[PDB]
Amino acid sequence: MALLKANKDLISAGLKEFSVLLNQQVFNDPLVSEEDMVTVVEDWMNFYINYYRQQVTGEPQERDKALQELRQELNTLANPFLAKYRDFLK
After folding, report:
1. 27: domain range?
2. CB under 8 Å, gap of 24 or more: what pairs does 62-66 form?
3. 39, 20, 27, 44: CA torsion to nearest 10
4. What DSSP character marks residue 81?
5. CATH code at 19?
6. Which of 27, 34, 35, 41 sees the fewest Cβ atoms within 10 Å?
7. Which residues fall in a coiled-coil region?
């Protein structure tokens, strides 16, 4: 797996941020619909990616390769979240 120390070190920070942030969720009094929640997950990652991209380092392709993977992490991170909500409520 092609993952530099500094490159992977950046994604690791965001990876844990999503896990911890998700832990805050209680799932009991969610007023927001499942549809409106979808757009939130997308915008949520867009905000994080914009921050990290503003603090990268390496090479043109390296930074692009490291940031490109950030999507995979957040992409799947949604799998458990969506499965939980969909399983808990409609």
Report:
1. 1-90
2. 62/4, 62/7, 65/2, 65/7, 66/3, 66/4, 66/7, 66/8, 66/10, 66/11
3. -10
4. H
5. 1.20.58.420
6. 35
7. none
Whether residue 10 contacts residue 66, with contact meaning beta carbons closer than 8 Å, is answered with yes
- For residue 7, how many other CB atoms are within 10 A of its CB? 20
Method: NMR
Two tokens, residue 63? 């930074």
Tally the domains of the chain. 1
Q: How far apart are CA 65 and CA 90, in angstroms?
A: 37
Q: How many CB atoms sit inside 10 A of residue 44's CB?
A: 15
Tokens read off for 11: 């994604």
